[PDB]
Symmetry: D2
Subunit: 275 residues, 4 copies
């Protein structure tokens, strides 16, 4: 499926029959993710929901953006995509980069969101995180896929996970390094990383009344828990959940947990409790 949005082609996948009948779950990908990266979650996510997966600009099978852009064009992408598919409201679950989009999207179009689940998410790109991005880009500008791997992924996963499932890491390392060596992937990553520099929804938080459940990884070395602790206080109806011994990629480290929180929060009939 292709959403001819603006001048470019936007790739999206739909699991389940989309008619106005059912609740939609929209997945907002991380900066290194595509639609196929959520294949393991499709069956569980689309049993009582219509699952909407799509690749953002400069992602996966979607077209490129060779000009300077912030995360704004990704937010407008999400709105126009939903309007294209005739989706009035939807449950939004985003992670990392996608989690940043969801917060911006909840700040501009709250009437298109039922409930929201953000994982491994900051309210604003700190000077610390920005310099990390400059590190990723500078290494990507050399075209060294081996170097680019060894500086990104050990901080995506917790040290415990990387060590425990090291053979799993190595087998994936043999193919990720060639992927990280291609100028196609890297140039897309550079652009996607620069766009995240201007991420700032701090002054939008006290006005986002969208029911939110925040997932926090204790061993997240990219978006540390203190950033999630901040988010939960300034969001009015925010829920917080911490995942012990887990890195920035909670999706893979604890898939049963991730799904439980997402399906559980979206699946609740009532959210107000009479206790």
């Amino acid at each position: 499926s292709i959403f001819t949005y603006q001048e470019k082609d936007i790739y999206y996948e739909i699991d389940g029959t989309l008619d106005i009948n059912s609740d939609v779950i929209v997945i907002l990908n991380g900066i290194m993710m595509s639609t196929k990266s959520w294949d393991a979650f499709v069956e569980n996510f689309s049993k009582n929901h219509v699952l909407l997966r799509y690749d953002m600009f400069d992602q996966g099978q979607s077209s490129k953006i060779e000009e300077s852009y912030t995360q704004t064009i990704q937010v407008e992408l999400l709105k126009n995509l939903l309007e294209h598919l005739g989706i009035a409201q939807a449950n939004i679950v985003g992670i990392s980069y996608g989690a940043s989009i969801a917060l911006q999207f909840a700040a501009k179009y709250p009437t298109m969101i039922k409930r929201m689940v953000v994982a491994n998410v900051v309210a604003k790109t700190s000077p610390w995180l920005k310099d990390i991005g400059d590190g990723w880009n500078e290494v990507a500008k050399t075209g060294n896929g081996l170097a680019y791997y060894h500086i990104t992924i050990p901080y995506i996963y917790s040290p415990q996970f990387y060590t425990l499932h090291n053979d799993w890491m190595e087998k994936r390392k043999e193919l990720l390094v060639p992927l990280f060596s291609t100028r196609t992937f890297l140039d897309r990553m550079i652009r996607l990383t620069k766009s995240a520099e201007t991420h700032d929804v701090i002054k939008d938080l006290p006005n986002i009344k969208t029911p939110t459940l925040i997932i926090s990884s204790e061993e997240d070395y990219l978006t540390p828990p203190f950033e999630q602790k901040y988010l939960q206080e300034h969001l009015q109806n925010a829920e917080l959940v911490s995942i012990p011994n887990c890195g920035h990629a909670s999706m893979y480290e604890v898939p049963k947990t991730f799904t439980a929180l997402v399906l559980g929060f979206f699946g609740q009939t009532k959210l107000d409790y009479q206790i």
Copy 2:
């Protein structure tokens, strides 16, 4: 005496079923805490029983079930659960327990693992430490005096987190002026003493490497009764266990974070397949 009443060993067991129960039903059974009854889960009935058949019951010395004046461990609560499930024609069930109920869930999963599909344990220990045991001796000792005011003050501020206790203090005070009378009646105190003493023998450490039951452990960071290091121990010795920590939350995760508790329970039971191909 009997509808919503299960006569068992010439004694009455009160229970409630929400939804219609047949052979197709996917059941969620709730194992109560040491101070809880079926009515304490009223706020979760609508959500838990939307796509499930909610089975709530009161254990011995609990709620509106009969009393047990003879000394007893938690083994009679484990057999109770089996015979109750058999009585209602329930072969398998999803078990969610908390505190005392979570201890019954573990002992049950060790004895009758075939009667469980999935399990969620919240604020749970694998074994009653000498620390927790002496805390119980203090609860009992004050209960032995009949002082309801004293009993309240030495139990409840440990049920909840300091932050929640402070933030919702007037929710604690209006709920206190009726708790103190409850804590002042002997029968309730007598039930509390026998239930607390039944937990002294909680020990499933040897059973942990054998429990193949898919389990989600709920941990509270500000739990001053069943501390996080206990759940961490449980999640390491169980073969198929997952751990979740709730920041700024007391022993009563049921009441402090009802949204989270529901999401985790419904989410873990509602998953089609726990096998992820990563």
Copy 3:
């Protein structure tokens, strides 16, 4: 010897030779403590320092105050005791109840403190903490030392410590219970607990420039770490230290660490680092 103060006798102990050129370390006792409860620390504490230990009102071998009193009585006791001994300025270290006294003292007489080390300390008695104190008092009124034991002591130590050294607990238990059963000990505890109800130095915290090192126990179920976190943020020159797997009684669980923190902070020649 004895310090006749304020109508009444105050018991104190001095280790070393007292000069005005003395490096004095004053220890502010916990609510259940006395001078005899710091004996194990005496040798280390009084090697390069002159150690002053004293029993506060309703404590140890000091007289009783049957009248209703707050912590401001203990505060004036410390000042007058120091003036009595001719001590102008001294390093003050306190824990629990004594640590609360230290804060009220540092806010009223900052010129009589060189450096301060407070352990297991809050800036204000929370409604939660006070209702705990009401529980202690309400049980203390029944005279049941057996009941009074099991509702106080297991919360003073961490579960790990109480379990690992249960023999150490049980042998002390056979002595603490007869002591907790005396009306003399209980009446003192009740009044010492009632005085701790009015603890509030929140307003004073930004005005305390006294160099402070805050000790916090992760498994403190009485004065939790978040209260220390609050303390370290609103004191301009305060450093924080967290002790893993430790309870409200730092001294007995980690005596090597406690003394290292106290001696190390006081022993430091210069606190300002060109770094």
Copy 4:
């Protein structure tokens, strides 16, 4: 010559060392084991406080500071034997040892082989073994260092040395560090030293020796340490039996730099203690 003052001729190579105070057989000595990016001058701020009641011994290990280079593949073994022979050179029988990061690894190995030459020990931001995780991070540093890019090398190392809070709070201070560090990180000789020091840490493994280390140890752990995480310190503390653990909230891998008062208090306090045995 051997009239080289503050120079120890070892295996036909020059080892630089600095001593604050005067040395004696009676002298109470503190030996500092540097981090992987550190030298003797990296401890200047601590000199006055550390040498108050102790004889401070600072020295640069191989491929560090002012000491000679190594252009052979070496493990941390040559760093351990260096410490032993340096101590013997100065006539030091026993000494208190404080080590951080890389030097902390040397301390444990030294405590594993020569426990008689240690009085008391302090280790900060320390692992009991180089994990496959920590090892692949080092490969990342090495890979980037190979390119000679100083700007890239800086951005992939230092943000993980300091805590995110600290790095943001004292940010403009970090960027003026950067104007001087980027050229330093661009020099081949510096990068080559960093590579060989990194490769040497790959074979760090003292799990074998932990239950045999009876040395009075105080472990300093940082909560926002993203290179030697807290869980690694908890492991060390449970398999060492004369070990105590202290945690530093809101602090990164460079604990000494973020909390200099705290670091000093723990070191001076744990060493300056006369008798460790408490009758409680």
